[PDB]
């Protein structure tokens, strides 16, 4: 009758309930249906190959030892401090770098016990999960990160995890990422890791992320385009100004080398060539070819002899051949990475 | 017999078991078998001379005080709740070559405690240790780092505790990719060091030595190419007509300033060491080539104050600079292949 | 005759029989908790990681009939903060938080007060790095409204209800100031009442209207960019015959501001849209690029007659047009982003 | 037996209750506290805070800790036994974060005198916060604040105050890497007020004065030398147009870069600081030198009697500019000597 | 008899031993002998003025309450779990900023009890000790960072610290440093700090650290050395080529300002001047004077048979400068590198 005596008779010292033994010992494995509710998503840094989530992890498992009939109500809420006196399913995230609980004025845990013995356990965590990156096309990539749930204390012979059939993964309304667009289709598969000591259960949820051009198209690509146009504008200067025209070719390579150094500064060290890397390296050839054309023109003019006619001819030939070359090559580079040879799932 | 009663009679304050006393007290040392399961690898920061791993350290030993009675025969093994890892004896263990290490605790402790029939006990923990390995930077582009991980014992000497590696396949790892290095699974050579501390006694230490071979792809695509372009620009400065006398200084001076900026940036990016590096050799060679271009231009300008001599100097220098640079580059690559 | 220790054991102690594991009014009406905060420190707003830190003296009040005493004549009785662990507390957690911790220096920074009718005051010192999204459409003169949310976690809305205090719920410490912003005196108070699969949870929300002063930015990159563009105009009065002077002027004025834009963007997070400072710097870059381009056209005209007169004409046109264009652009840009949008 | 003495004094057999302050429902207990600064430094303006390392000590009297078994009056007890006696609440109000020091044991001291007085000293490490005014950046005087304050008990039950003599000690040889710590330290009552009640609070002020050495070497001197370099154009022959425009250009560029680098190390503040005026005015001088060159070039291109006017303007400026720079520099130091 | 009963009778609950009372209570102070074993070193950050160690701190003392006779064995090792249940001497590092234990698979502690009653206690630690440094001659400086052991609870009237007679500080073989080299000599002193509460025992050990110029030379001096070579190679350029000479001066001065900024970026700001600032400032003044000498020559060639013939005088000025500036720089190099290495500085050794 008394609620404190009821709790003591249910799971207290007088109860005789044991938290050291899993339910249904030496019998069928205990099925644990879990689902997560993402609260905060972000800090997806490519340098450290990691990202941070903030999930309301929940679990639902059945035990017969927690059956009660004194209270007519079926669903009952308990103090979160009762959780140490009941059996819990071991559950650790395999692909993580650092995680912690959250306590403010109390632990952020919810415990609910149903009449038939079903238990709803939910705890608030914060995970710095690790997911591999692919930077073949760095500004136009579709990077998918993973969150693995796997048991550690018991093999699959005793503990089995599986997602909830309806609404397995939720996202808070108004969720957004600073640079990415989280998809709405989230895949659910089975990892089921198999170590030499035993075969352990493992549940995996996939996350799909797509990067936008918004920051890069306006910070990275456009300045290089205007630099190449600056090196371009040399052809229209008079050829007698030997130190004047060459100055543009001198400065463009320096500034674009500095821009290239800054471009890969905030990116992880990778062997393969990145899309921004190839774009800017190939743009380097154009600004260097401007200086090469000037050197050829000056050498021709510096050995009447109709050489000035040939110098103007090569000047206009360059000023008419660079447009087609850039306008065709850059659009080809765009289309191949967009659809033709990359991206497109 | 209830499982509660079996647990109580096996290891509890209600049974004659003392966790503070090692098995076979004042007798044969307790042989301990250890095997590691790498899970996550990387973040090898050369600046701090350390790297971070994430392992599943598993240790199994013998303990006659933990014998499963023949009353019930359910299985050879018997899983126990991880919270009783603190109720039975454990072997003292730590990593000598470790900087900052910690356990993991998410929704439960990450510990597994098997108990066998004959008394053998298997124990595994999930650890995230930050080991430090002394990197050698003599040949930066084609280096081969040798980072190791040595276990040890602290409380007990070799007369009580002794570590032995697994008989077969002691170190495992599944499809771990690295951003900068290429760990070789076959080259997992490992011995043991049996560290001897003066004033206390012997202490067993079994070590694993990882062999890492850095790929030079990123550096080749990022650092060496701009230097090559600067060298080609210095060469192209030669063909400029010397009559201007002011359209040839800027190319060379700005090239040497760019090289100065590059070497400063690379020094800032790299840890501070006293010895020379191959990358430093490349940078100083490029800067010396720029200085040579500057002094050659100065010589030509002096000789201009004669035009035949200036033209001969220009032709000879333009003939010797690129072939000499190519020979130097080829021999440099051959030395540091 | 009644020793205080015996009284404490009689009211909340082991002899009392009070159970801290059961909420007040069990199987009854939901327990209401009127909570109010007291900000002590504010600031450290960093846009790169999109969060801010507060140092609040969180307080809570609720009624619990099991803590009613009539032995002591005094009504407001204070207790040792260590007594908290022996009495019930209301669950609470800050929904939009990234890292939280108490403050333990020579003791726990907690305060317990118990009234005669059972009303309990419990104030605990916290420190929260709450997360608040920002709209950076007009970055130099933005208006951010960061949010602090208080919410129950364990008990549902059917058992625990959070309500702001009637008057003066959120205060500010005297002399509180920020290095970059202005904290408005008004602070909106609204409910949110979030719900999930488990059920409906009570919620509490407070809005801190924040505004930015352009004092630092106007002197850090607005004035320098204007001075650089003013430098770029001095090429007009240089004789068209002399090439290298005008070439160097144009080149350096173009080059020196790309690094300015990179440095300005370095301290800001990556964003898809375009910020006002970005628009200003891009327009200045276009202006200086056109300044170099017009000189290129002049040099083309001079080098092919009396075309030198036409070169002087176009130079004068540029000299009389560029200041006008920059003035009209500045008066256009400093009006819409400042007042209209 | 010492164990029996400890048990009878304040142990399990004693019946002492650690949850009740001395003189319960009576006069407030007066607590005298004096601190000992051990290491002072790590003063960073980027986060607007500084780190101390204090040997905080407290003294209070309680009648329940009086003994007569031991003739000795000053008794030292194990620090691990501190959990069984009443300890006054004490938190540092202007603290951004603090932590104890546990190395091989708890760093605590307990001392019980015969009359009942108790000495309690605990080592700490406080990252306090102190707002700074940057009106005169290289020659400012900041007063960073340490505030002791009670939290659990109101003024009606706990009163703090400094010792009569030697309240704050600084370890011999202590010095600041950045500032010059004064010997004078103000000790004022703080006495904060809240809506819960009246809480006692104790304030001690540290007078911090900045040393101009590093700034003078690294930031003023290069600016002065660079603006001196900007003057080298006025002696060059006017024929070399690119030579003069070049030095003007690179001087302007390098001074802008120096401004960015100098302000990269300070917190963002709405108001202008002292250093920015000097550097901005020197940059304006370089800009005006370039502009005067441009004007003289215009004059040269309109023996036209213009060579005389161009040379007159150049020579007049070559002497007016040093006078203007000297008078501004003297005025800029004089105004800051007026402020301080 | 039984080992569990032996442990209970020696110092367990049945024993009656009290861990809250120091040995030899109301008697002579319990002397404690400590000796450390360094396992790693380095991370000496000049900016924050601290260094990190990894020591196997050890202690020895006596107490008659732990004397045993049942077991003939003398050196008896005990579980570190038991270690918290015996009296231990208070100890802390005064000049520390942050320290912690190491808990990996167990607590890294050791407990040993000898027959005569002596106790051994070795605990792993990790100290971010603080050591102020003097940077009067930074690139070629010598530093003496300290590790100051001290008691906190008991006064010198109840606890006395002292080093071991033989090999007090041991260093694990093969240890090296990233930026310095550790001298084999380690001075030991007595610090015996005095407070307003009493006389406290204190023990200080000196570490001598010397900085090698391997990195700093090739990163600062040699590039700054070649910049001034670039600066004087203009003197062979004819005055006629005015833009070449002036550009050769200004780029050289600008790069040296940038290099000075980059050099000072790695040190805490100090009111006093350092060696690297002297070198950088003088060598930069040299290129500034080279540009100014250009300005003077150009003015001379610009009107200072009635011929001006100022070309010959300008050529003489250039010839004198080309023979004076490299020579003056060479004598400055020798004088500075000897004066900051032999006679009045670098005598701290
Ligand atoms: C757990 O589910 C498995 C199938 O996945 C089933 O065989 C077993 O009986 C279940 N155990 C229960 C419901 O206790
Ligand atoms: C450890 O090294 C010692 C060296 O004496 C050797 O006797 C022993 O067999 C080694 N043990 C292992 C497991 O390698
Ligand atoms: C508590 O307040 C709520 C609304 O906040 C109200 O419905 C309820 O009646 C109040 N009192 C009790 C005893 O539940
Ligand atoms: C504390 O000091 C106050 C000062 O007014 C005094 O009234 C009170 O009696 C003192 N209490 C003591 C000494 O216990
Ligand atoms: C411990 O050493 C001190 C200092 O030398 C000495 O006075 C004392 O007698 C020694 N022994 C004991 C048992 O205190």
Swiss-Prot record, chain B:
Parts of the chain on the Cytoplasmic side: 240-244
Catalytic activity, as annotated: chloride(in) = chloride(out)
Keyword terms of this UniProt record: Cell membrane, Cell projection, Chloride, Chloride channel, Cytoplasm, Disease variant, Disulfide bond, Glycoprotein, Ion channel, Ion transport, Ligand-gated ion channel, Membrane, Phosphoprotein, Postsynaptic cell membrane, Receptor, Signal, Synapse, Transmembrane, Transmembrane helix, Transport
UniProt note on regulation of activity: Channel opening is triggered by extracellular glycine. Heteropentameric channels composed of GLRB and GLRA1 are activated by lower glycine levels than homopentameric GLRA1.
Superkingdom in the source lineage: Eukaryota
Major location (coarse): membrane
Topological category with respect to the lipid bilayer: Multi-pass membrane protein
Binding site for glycine 2: 200
Result after altering residue 201 to D: In HKPX2; heteropentameric channel complexes with GLRA1 require much higher glycine levels for channel activation
Positions that bind glycine 1: 58, 124
Transmembrane parts of this sequence: 219-239, 245-265, 278-299, 313-336
Coiled coil keyword on record: no
GO process annotations (BP): acrosome reaction; adult walking behavior; chemical synaptic transmission; chloride transmembrane transport; gamma-aminobutyric acid receptor clustering; monoatomic ion transport; nervous system development; neuropeptide signaling pathway
Record note on what altering residue 4 to A does: Prevents proper assembly of the GLRA2/GLRB heteropentamer receptor
UniProt-annotated glycosylation sites, renumbered to this chain: 4, 192
Disulphide linkage map: 133-147, 193-205
Role noted for this protein: Subunit of heteromeric glycine-gated chloride channels. Plays an important role in the down-regulation of neuronal excitability. Contributes to the generation of inhibitory postsynaptic currents.
Protein name: Glycine receptor subunit beta
Source species taxonomy: Eukaryota, Metazoa, Chordata, Craniata, Vertebrata
Gene: GLRB
UniProtKB/Swiss-Prot annotation, chain C:
GO cellular component term, pick one: dendrite
Post-translational modification: Phosphorylated by PKA; this causes down-regulation of channel activity.
Hydrolase as UniProt keyword: no
Organ and tissue specificity: Widely distributed throughout the central nervous system.
Pfam families the record matches: Neur_chan_LBD (PF02931), Neur_chan_memb (PF02932)
Entry annotated with the keyword Zinc: yes
Chemical reaction(s) catalysed: chloride(in) = chloride(out)
Entry's Gene Ontology BP terms: chloride transmembrane transport; presynaptic modulation of chemical synaptic transmission; protein homooligomerization
Glycosylation site positions: 32
Lipid bilayer topology: Multi-pass membrane protein
Location in the cell: Postsynaptic cell membrane; Perikaryon; Cell projection, Dendrite; Synapse
Function: Glycine receptors are ligand-gated chloride channels. Channel opening is triggered by extracellular glycine. Channel characteristics depend on the subunit composition; heteropentameric channels display faster channel closure. Plays an important role in the down-regulation of neuronal excitability. Contributes to the generation of inhibitory postsynaptic currents. Contributes to increased pain perception in response to increased prostaglandin E2 levels. Plays a role in cellular responses to ethanol.
Family: Belongs to the ligand-gated ion channel (TC 1.A.9) family. Glycine receptor (TC 1.A.9.3) subfamily. GLRA3 sub-subfamily.
Protein name: Glycine receptor subunit alpha-3
């Amino acid at each position: 009758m008394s609620p404190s005596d009821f709790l003591d008779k249910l799971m207290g010292r007088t109860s005789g309930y044991d938290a050291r033994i899993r339910p249904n010992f030496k019998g069928p494995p205990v099925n644990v249906t879990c689902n997560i509710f993402i609260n905060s998503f972000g800090s997806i840094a490519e340098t450290t190959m990691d990202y941070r989530v903030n999930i309301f992890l929940r679990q639902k498992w059945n035990d017969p030892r927690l059956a009660y009939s004194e209270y007519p109500d079926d669903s009952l809420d308990l103090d979160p401090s009762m959780l140490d006196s009941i059996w819990k399913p071991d559950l650790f995230f395999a692909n993580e770098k650092g995680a912690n609980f959250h306590e403010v004025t109390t632990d952020n845990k919810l415990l609910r016990i149903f009449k038939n013995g079903n238990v709803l356990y939910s705890i608030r965590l914060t995970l710095t999960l690790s997911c591999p990156m692919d930077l073949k096309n760095f500004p136009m990539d579709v990077q998918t990160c993973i969150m693995q749930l796997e048991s550690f204390g018991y093999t699959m012979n005793d503990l089995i995890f599986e997602w909830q059939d309806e609404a397995p993964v939720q996202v808070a309304e108004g969720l957004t990422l600073p640079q990415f667009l989280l998809k709405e289709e989230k895949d659910l598969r089975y990892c089921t890791k198999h170590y030499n000591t035993g075969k352990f259960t493992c549940i995996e949820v996939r996350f799909h992320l797509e990067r936008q051009m918004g920051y890069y198209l306006i910070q990275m690509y456009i300045p290089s385009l205007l630099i190449v146009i600056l090196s371009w504008v040399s052809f229209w200067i008079n050829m007698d100004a030997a130190p004047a025209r060459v100055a543009l070719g001198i400065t463009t390579v320096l500034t674009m080398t500095t821009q290239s150094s800054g471009s890969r500064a905030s990116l992880p060290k990778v062997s393969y060539v990145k899309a921004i890397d190839i774009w800017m390296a190939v743009c380097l050839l154009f600004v260097f070819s401007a200086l090469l054309e000037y050197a050829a023109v000056n050498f021709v003019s510096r050995q009447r002899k109709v050489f000035i006619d040939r110098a103007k001819k090569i000047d206009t030939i360059s000023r008419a051949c660079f447009p087609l070359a850039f306008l065709i090559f850059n659009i080809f580079y765009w289309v191949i990475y967009k659809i033709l040879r990359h991206e497109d799932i | 017999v209830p499982a509660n009663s079996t647990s109580n009679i096996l290891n509890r304050l209600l049974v004659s078991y003392d966790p503070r006393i090692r098995p076979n007290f004042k007798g044969i040392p307790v042989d301990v078998v250890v095997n590691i399961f790498i899970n996550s690898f990387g973040s090898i920061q050369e600046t701090t001379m350390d790297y971070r791993v994430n392992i599943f350290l598993r240790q199994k030993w013998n303990d006659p005080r933990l014998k499963l009675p023949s009353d019930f025969r359910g299985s050879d093994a018997l899983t126990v709740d991880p919270t009783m890892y603190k109720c039975l004896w454990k072997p003292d263990l730590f990593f000598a070559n470790e900087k900052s290490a910690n356990f993991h605790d998410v929704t439960q402790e990450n510990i597994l405690l098997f108990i066998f029939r004959d008394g053998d006990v298997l124990v595994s923990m999930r650890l995230s240790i930050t080991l430090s390995c002394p990197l050698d930077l003599t040949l930066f582009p084609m280096d081969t780092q040798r980072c190791k991980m040595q276990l040890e014992s602290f409380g007990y000497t070799t007369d009580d505790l002794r570590f032995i590696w697994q008989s077969g396949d002691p170190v495992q790892l599944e499809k771990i990719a690295l951003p900068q290095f290429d760990i070789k699974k076959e080259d997992i050579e490992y011995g043991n060091c049996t560290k001897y501390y003066k004033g206390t006694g012997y202490y067993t230490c079994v070590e694993v030595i990882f062999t890492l071979r850095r790929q030079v792809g990123f550096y080749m695509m990022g650092v060496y190419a701009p230097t090559l372009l600067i060298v080609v620009l210095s060469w192209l400065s030669f063909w400029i007509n010397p009559d201007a006398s002011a359209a040839r200084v800027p190319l060379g001076i700005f090239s040497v300033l760019s090289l100065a900026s590059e070497c400063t940036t690379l020094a800032a990016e790299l840890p501070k060491v006293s010895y020379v590096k191959a990358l430093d050799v490349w940078l100083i060679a490029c800067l010396l080539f720029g200085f040579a271009s500057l002094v050659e231009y100065a010589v030509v300008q002096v000789m201009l104050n004669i035009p035949t001599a200036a033209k001969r100097i220009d032709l000879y220098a333009r003939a010797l600079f690129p072939f000499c640079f190519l020979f130097f580059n080829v021999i440099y690559w051959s030395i540091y292949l």
